[PDB]
Amino acid sequence: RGSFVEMVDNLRGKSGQGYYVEMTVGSPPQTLNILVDTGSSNFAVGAAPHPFLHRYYQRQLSSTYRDLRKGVYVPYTQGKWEGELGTDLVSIPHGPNVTVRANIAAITESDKFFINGSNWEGILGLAYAEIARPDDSLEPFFDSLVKQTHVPNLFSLQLCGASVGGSMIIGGIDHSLYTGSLWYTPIRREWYYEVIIVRVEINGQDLKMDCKEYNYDKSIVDSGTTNLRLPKKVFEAAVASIKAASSTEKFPDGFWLGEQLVCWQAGTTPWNIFPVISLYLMGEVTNQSFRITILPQQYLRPVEDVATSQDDCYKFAISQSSTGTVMGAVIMEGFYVVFDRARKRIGFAVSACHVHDEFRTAAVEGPFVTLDMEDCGYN
Numbered sequence: 001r002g003s004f005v006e007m008v009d010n011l012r013g014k015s016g017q018g019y020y021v022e023m024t025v026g027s028p029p030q031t032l033n034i035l036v037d038t039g040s041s042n043f044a045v046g047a048a049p050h051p052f053l054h055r056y057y058q059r060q061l062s063s064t065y066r067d068l069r070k071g072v073y074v075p076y077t078q079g080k081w082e083g084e085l086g087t088d089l090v091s092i093p094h095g096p097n098v099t100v101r102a103n104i105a106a107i108t109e110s111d112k113f114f115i116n117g118s119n120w121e122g123i124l125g126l127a128y129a130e131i132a133r134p135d136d137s138l139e140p141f142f143d144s145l146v147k148q149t150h151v152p153n154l155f156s157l158q159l160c161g162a163s164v165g166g167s168m169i170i171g172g173i174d175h176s177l178y179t180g181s182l183w184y185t186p187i188r189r190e191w192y193y194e195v196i197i198v199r200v201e202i203n204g205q206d207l208k209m210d211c212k213e214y215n216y217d218k219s220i221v222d223s224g225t226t227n228l229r230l231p232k233k234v235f236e237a238a239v240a241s242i243k244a245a246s247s248t249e250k251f252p253d254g255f256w257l258g259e260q261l262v263c264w265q266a267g268t269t270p271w272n273i274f275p276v277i278s279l280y281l282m283g284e285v286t287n288q289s290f291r292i293t294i295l296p297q298q299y300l301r302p303v304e305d306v307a308t309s310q311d312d313c314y315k316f317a318i319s320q321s322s323t324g325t326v327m328g329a330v331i332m333e334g335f336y337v338v339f340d341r342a343r344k345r346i347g348f349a350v351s352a353c354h355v356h357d358e359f360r361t362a363a364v365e366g367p368f369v370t371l372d373m374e375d376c377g378y379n
C-alpha cells in the first residue's frame, strides 16, 4: 500500500496519441503496447498485419489461447473494429507480479481505429462490464485481474503531458505521485466512470447554468480521449466566458471551434491572458463538494506535426459534445486520479508532474458547501 516503485513511469506516449502500457499475452509471452482507456471495457488487440502496427497478437504462437467461437463488431462514432473473442494468459511486466486468464478481442479488421505512426497496437478498456461489447457477460480485464488474484480493486493514473509518460499503479496508490490531499467524488453508476459536476467556473466566474446541463447526458473520466468535451449548451457558454477572459488578444473564431491552430514565436506563449477552468465535483458527504482547477497549459495542446509552419502552435482542446462531459487527458494531466472501484469513488489530487508556470498551478481544493447536488445528475 502507498509505494509501488516498479510501476512508476510505466506509461509512455506521444502528444496526440495517448498513453500506453506494455503488456504480454499468451505463452510464450508476446509483448504488446496497449493504450490505457478508462472510457471503454474491452481488451482488444491487433491480431493481423495492418500496416500501421508495429507488432500484433499471433494466436497460433500461444499454447494457452482458447477460442470462444464468437465474433464481435464494434463501431464507434469515428472508426470501427471487428474481431474474434478468446481468452489467454495476460501479465503487465511493470505491473503486479501475477498472470491472469482474460478475455481478448483479436482484431482482424478495423477502420480509423489504429493511428498511423503510433506505438500501440491494442486498447485496455478499464471501465465496467455494463459497456463491454458484445454485452456485459464479457468480463473486462480488470474484473478478471481482481477475481483471480489478490490485487486490491483499484488503480490509479498519473498522466504527464507534453514524448509523454506517466504511471499506472495497479492495486494501489503511490503517494509520491501527488501533492496535498486526495478528494473523492462518487462513481454515480458503474458503466463508464461516471461522476457528477455541480458547478463550473471560468477564472472564478460561475457559468450559472442549471447544473443538470453539466451532466447532459452524463459526465465521465476518460483517459482514451484527449479533449475536455462539454455538452453543447455548456461549451457555448464556457467558450463565451473564455473569449471574454482572453480579450486582450483576438483569434479567428475557427480557433475556438478547433478548426484552426494558433501559433506564437517560440518560448513566448502568453499563458496569462488565458483563464483557469474549475469543475466542482460532487463530494463524499451530503451538501459537500470540492473543486479541480486546470490551466491553459492543459487545454491548449502543442501541435508538433506542423510541416507548413516554423513556430509554437496550439490546438484549443475543449470541444462541444453530444455524449456528455468527457474529462479526457486535458483534465487528467493536471491530476493524480484514483479509480477506487472498491469504494465506488474517484479521487483527485494535484499531480506531482503536471505542466505549470511560476504564477499558477493546477489545484484540488475543498470542502465547499453546494446544495441540490443530486438534481445535477441527468436521468
Ligand SMILES: C[C@]1(c2cc(NC(=O)c3ccc(C#N)cn3)ccc2F)N=C(N)OC[C@@H]1F
Binding pocket: 016, 017, 018, 019, 035, 037, 038, 039, 040, 076, 079, 113, 115, 123, 222, 223, 224, 225, 226, 329, 330
Ligand atoms: C475505444 C475508444 C478509442 C480511443 C482511442 N484513443 C486515442 O486514440 C487517444 C489519443 C490521444 C489520447 C490522449 N491524450 C487518448 N487517446 C482510439 C480509438 C478508440 F476507439 N475509447 C474512448 N475512450 O473513446 C473513443 C473510443 F470509444
Ligand code: NA
Binding pocket: 145, 146, 147, 148, 149, 150, 151
Ligand atoms: Na481478489
Ligand code: NA
Binding pocket: 175, 176, 177, 178, 179, 180
Ligand atoms: Na503526496
